[PDB]
């Protein structure tokens, strides 16, 4: 019922894929190679000229976070009420903010900007540790008592940063335990260990 | 006091859209202004979730992130589409607006002089998506999504307003967006807000560039 149109990398589809997998949803991967993308056709047909492109039945969507929020809304991963929904958005936007800085590093300034990025990393991750500390002692989810699309997005954020800066979660016990706990969920655990995830590079330029 | 409180710097910036939304919806709110000098003191910043503003107060609910505030008000005031599918289209529009706003932000604050020519050159291709969406929704005679206004409309409206200042006549190539701006700006409550000192006497950005 779901189709993900994206390049052969984890990137901005990693979180939504983990969500679909953990939620026991099946989906088709429409892999677009760089060569195919360079042909120009598909790009021209995309709303903002970019991927991922997402299909849910007759509904076609663009924008990674829109897909996340759509799945969150339709699959019930958006908090229990409006207050929690606001909290879920606050976390996701925060994740998006850091991901954008991560993307800038990876794609435009890896060699000269990595040292400074890693130096400031602790200060960028602390907010999430604080949020967990204020919710059920950090024993459940980033918001409320049920998983939300923000959890999958934050999880990915944390996974890629552990690769960029190994041990960056050492000073944050709640985040560390959070990563292990979510990664241990049966279906997600299976996904993370599968070739579909493992044999895909994190980004499109070979940097991580 | 008022249930709504906006904590931000004395600029329109990332609070312009949510303010238009509140004003157009007949809502009142408190403006708690933070001067750069106060911000430099460090206390407030240290207390903010992500170390930045805006900070929004709704009763005892304290929020951060401009788009979280927009979505929150959109949810609470019924400005998020008529159903789940429209809500998704509303998000798609806002995320697009957010993407352009970040580029606009990069130009204004980190590379105005050297990047303006290319930014303006590339502007048309960046605005086209919104004109397209408009053309696919009742000939663009109503809103960006569906037949009722959404929080995305206020965000897109602001985006268009500041780009007309950045590049006068940029909407000449987009009749639907042009009429759209004139139409929404004409809404009684919004029109009054846009002409008021509360809005007019605040600069668009915080570094004097526009």
């Amino acid at each position: 019922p779901y189709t993900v149109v994206y390049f052969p990398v984890r990137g901005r589809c990693a979180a939504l894929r983990m969500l679909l997998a953990d939620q026991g949803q099946s989906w088709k991967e429409e892999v677009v190679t760089v060569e195919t993308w360079q042909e120009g056709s598909l790009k021209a047909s995309c709303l903002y000229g970019q991927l991922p492109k997402f299909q849910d039945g007759d509904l076609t969507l663009y924008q990674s976070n829109t897909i996340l929020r759509h799945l969150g809304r339709t699959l019930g991963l958006y908090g229990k009420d409006q207050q929690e929904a606001a909290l879920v958005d606050m976390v996701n936007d925060g994740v998006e903010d850091l991901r954008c800085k991560y993307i800038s590093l990876i794609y435009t300034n890896y060699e000269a900007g990595k040292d400074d990025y890693v130096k400031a990393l602790p200060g960028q991750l602390k907010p999430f540790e604080t949020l967990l500390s204020q919710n059920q002692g950090g024993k459940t989810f980033i918001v409320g008592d049920q998983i939300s699309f923000a959890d999958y997005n934050l999880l990915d954020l944390l996974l890629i940063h552990e690769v960029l800066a190994p041990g960056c979660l050492d000073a944050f016990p709640l985040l560390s335990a959070y990563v292990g706990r979510l990664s241990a969920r049966p279906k997600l655990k299976a996904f993370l260990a599968s070739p579909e995830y493992v044999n895909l590079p994190i980004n499109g330029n070979g940097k991580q």
Side-chain angles (χ1 to χ4, degrees), chain A:
Chain A
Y2 299 117
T3 297
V4 176
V5 187
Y6 192 55
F7 304 105
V9 310
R10 299 179 191 171
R12 279 184 176 286
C13 279
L16 64 89
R17 282 163 176 160
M18 292 200 291
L19 181 164
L20 292 171
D22 189 55
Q23 291 301 312
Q25 301 301 314
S26 61
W27 76 89
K28 291 190 182 68
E29 284 286 355
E30 193 65 66
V31 186
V32 179
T33 65
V34 172
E35 179 175 0
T36 293
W37 184 248
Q38 287 174 165
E39 183 277 351
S41 293
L42 182 59
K43 179 180 176 62
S45 68
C46 294
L47 181 58
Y48 301 114
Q50 299 192 304
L51 297 182
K53 173 182 182 180
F54 195 74
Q55 295 176 181
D56 179 353
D58 291 66
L59 177 64
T60 296
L61 301 169
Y62 296 99
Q63 291 287 172
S64 64
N65 291 310
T66 285
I67 299 165
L68 283 174
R69 287 193 168 83
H70 172 63
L71 291 175
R73 194 174 295 108
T74 60
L75 294 178
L77 322 178
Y78 218 138
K80 72 183 180 69
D81 54 28
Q82 298 182 326
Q83 175 168 290
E84 296 199 327
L87 301 179
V88 172
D89 284 333
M90 183 164 76
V91 177
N92 204 71
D93 289 349
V95 170
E96 173 59 20
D97 275 11
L98 220 207
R99 182 181 294 282
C100 277
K101 295 175 185 179
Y102 169 86
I103 288 173
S104 178
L105 171 69
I106 293 294
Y107 291 105
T108 77
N109 196 209
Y110 195 83
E111 297 70 32
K114 187 177 179 176
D115 289 355
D116 297 319
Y117 188 91
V118 179
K119 177 174 61 182
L121 226 199
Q124 296 303 298
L125 292 170
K126 181 184 182 64
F128 300 111
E129 173 82 359
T130 295
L131 286 176
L132 282 175
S133 74
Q134 311 179 316
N135 181 40
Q136 307 304 325
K139 302 184 286 188
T140 60
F141 301 102
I142 196 60
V143 171
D145 304 329
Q146 308 196 189
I147 203 164
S148 66
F149 62 93
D151 286 295
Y152 297 107
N153 203 13
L154 173 58
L155 170 57
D156 180 64
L157 184 72
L158 302 172
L159 291 174
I160 63 186
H161 279 82
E162 286 187 306
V163 170
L164 179 66
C168 61
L169 272 49
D170 289 357
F172 307 113
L174 298 185
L175 283 175
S176 292
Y178 171 79
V179 167
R181 191 169 63 247
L182 272 53
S183 297
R185 298 165 68 84
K187 299 190 185 303
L188 184 47
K189 173 189 179 62
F191 179 67
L192 296 175
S194 74
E196 192 181 321
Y197 171 79
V198 176
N199 298 338
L200 230 55
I202 300 181
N203 306 295
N205 68 342
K207 302 182 181 178
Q208 66 180 197

